[PDB]
Symmetry: C3
Subunit: 273 residues, 3 copies
């Protein structure tokens, strides 16, 4: 049995993707999630949708309760969390509207708790050092890549996401710099969402959608809120189709070994007295 | 009508630059500014001076209330904010005593709010993502550069400021590293001052004064508090002359289109529900 | 007269190194240290041992009270602080089990106070900007290197430690990146421990022990908590022997000029009104 958590990002957090919807507000040991969980189905598969920034997009990236969001999805019984995230492109070949099925990150955040195991919660006791060599589930990523090909979508099979704190966009010097570090796309939300999913033993993958070329590339429209939202208005349907078609495929294969290995990694990352 | 906010940095925060001075303590939604606003004039031009670290230099860079400072200057009616900032040189050609009219930054701060739009203040509602491609006003910078040439000052026309959290100085490995990233000068205060000025719709520019070569360059005196203050004692008059001569030139040209474009950029960076 | 503070890191915080042990719990203006001070001797030399993470390893790196730990050791009268720290190797030639007598750092921490002089404590008044060009005591390092050679240990004479916030391990993209920045080893605790020791006027040195190759190097066992603790179980005796044999050598040479120079650097880093 699988259950798919969906975290919707900017422009890309649409409840109408699920059939048989029911709204459920929850609390967690780490506070309230961004908004109500939306429970529902894609074909025969149970899903749980959550708007990263709230359904009215009122929560900036620095203030998103990543702990509560992941906790809530875990507690509802999710085996997988597949998210969407708008991003800037740091590579000529990654065009606005393209999907990138990211496989790595570089952290540039500064303000965010990255662990459940902070010494202050009885529900997460001990000192936990989660491995991040392979932060995203490669099996979930594989299904996303295969499905995007079946849909004929422009989709990059890997990529390194640099996650900045924000909410400001990057300077040009920063944009240039991130290119030298080997970053391929830029956003404000992947870290610590991916990290906490891993501590939760959840298969996590990210549908990154390029919306702009940040500010490094000449003769392109400058990143701005309006430019991002424009690209998403034009291209959001592709992320929706990809979730709708991927999720049944996840539901039809066997995940017990993958989930057991993740559970083991998570459990053995915690040192108790 | 222009009104010029002046934020004075280390060694470079002198009330006697203004004629017809009056002290005004203010409060803001983000707390108290570093010290009293000093209201006054340079020739016919209204100005507002504020000591970044307080007039006795009692507030370390991490604890400066950048939000309150920018808010106070905005509320007093400033159209421009021209600041001074001491810095380390990361380039042989940038000698101690030189001025750099910086045009870019790299953020290495970790502790600082970078936005007015934190979800907690009625005066700044919404989610704001300000563009930082061009963080400094190029027209204000142009007048500073032109004026420095008229004064015969050693002045670099551009440069990338890496802003570290401090209050410690950088290690040698860090200094080396920042050079590879393309940083030209190093300080602890540009970020988030520049960012918040942009959200405020204010033309912001920075008179950076090199005081040392940080710790990368052989056979130079090591950076220390005493070395910084020594260089400033010797060279502060140049920043003073540059402000005194630049500000009347700003006052004599037309800023309405520049200010309108900045106001638009700022306003359209905010998403409301 | 010398007195050697010892901070023990992961797997490497063993009270039985000291003869004539007495436990002493203390408080400081910055809160409680990680655990009781253990007072005792190595040959004729007074020492003070403190477990960085508490004796049961219950305090994650982000939550270690670096200020209290250094303060407590200073207040007990330590002239030197020699620490152990497990780390990942970022260089082929630094093999698991090797010691590195690190001489530089790159900060990647985000959550940590790095100064005693925060404006909130009467015991540390003023604005302090400590120089970090040479963060570790070269004389203490020299004795460690010489002693490791006398013991026949695999020991690297220098190295740059990148200190990450954690508690997660690095992604592969990050690991790759830190290699390009010239980092040689990776940990979560050197910063701000080294910085605060310098403000305290204490000779600080670090016995770094490589436990893994992080996640950059093919055909090596992946970093995990279990892998780290396994390497330490196998190799901790080497750090113990090195402390036991180094400390008497420190005790037998003259430190007054070295300590005076450090005290001066620390004192002149503070600006008062
Ligand atoms: C309000 C609103 C909507 S626009 C700002 C969103 C989009 N997101 C991703 C993003 C898209 N382009 C980016 C870029 N160039 N840098 C960082 N992040 C991004 C970053 C913010 O969460
Ligand atoms: C107290 C006092 C006066 S000296 C410390 C000031 C100077 N400033 C700028 C600065 C000058 N040189 C620097 C360097 N090498 N690194 C960072 N920042 C700087 C950083 C601190 O705010
Ligand atoms: C609980 C427990 C014991 S394992 C986690 C410890 C070891 N330490 C140093 C360390 C060893 N290898 C590392 C690596 N690859 N990255 C960062 N840090 C490290 C980082 C954590 O404090
Ligand atoms: Cl923080
Ligand atoms: Cl960084």
């Amino acid at each position: 049995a699988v259950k798919i958590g969906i975290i919707g990002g900017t422009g890309l957090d649409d409840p109408e993707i699920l059939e048989g919807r029911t709204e459920k507000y929850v609390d967690t040991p780490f506070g309230k999630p961004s908004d109500a969980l939306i429970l529902g189905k894609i074909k025969n598969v149970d899903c749980v949708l959550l708007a990263r920034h709230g359904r009215q997009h009122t929560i900036m990236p620095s203030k998103v309760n990543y702990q509560a969001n992941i906790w809530a999805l875990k507690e509802e019984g999710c085996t997988h969390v597949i998210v969407t995230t708008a991003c800037g492109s740091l590579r000529e070949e990654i065009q606005p509207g393209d999907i990138v099925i990211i496989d790595q990150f570089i952290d540039r955040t500064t303000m965010r708790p990255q662990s459940f195991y902070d010494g202050s919660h009885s529900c997460a006791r001990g000192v936990c050092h989660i491995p991040m060599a392979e932060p995203f589930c490669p099996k979930t990523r594989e299904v996303l890549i295969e499905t995007a090909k079946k849909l004929g979508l422009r989709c990059h099979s890997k990529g390194t996401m640099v996650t900045i704190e924000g909410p400001r966009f990057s300077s040009r010097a920063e944009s240039f710099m991130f290119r030298t570090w080997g970053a391929d796309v830029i956003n404000m939300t992947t870290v610590p969402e991916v990290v906490l999913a891993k501590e939760a033993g959840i298969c996590y993958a990210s549908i990154a959608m390029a919306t702009d070329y940040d500010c490094w590339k000449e003769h392109e429209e400058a990143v701005s809120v309006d430019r991002v939202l424009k690209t998403l208005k034009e291209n959001a349907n592709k992320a929706k189709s990809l979730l709708l078609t991927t999720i049944p495929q996840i539901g039809s294969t066997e995940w017990s070994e993958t989930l057991h290995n993740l559970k083991n990694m998570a459990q053995f990352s915690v040192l108790l007295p």
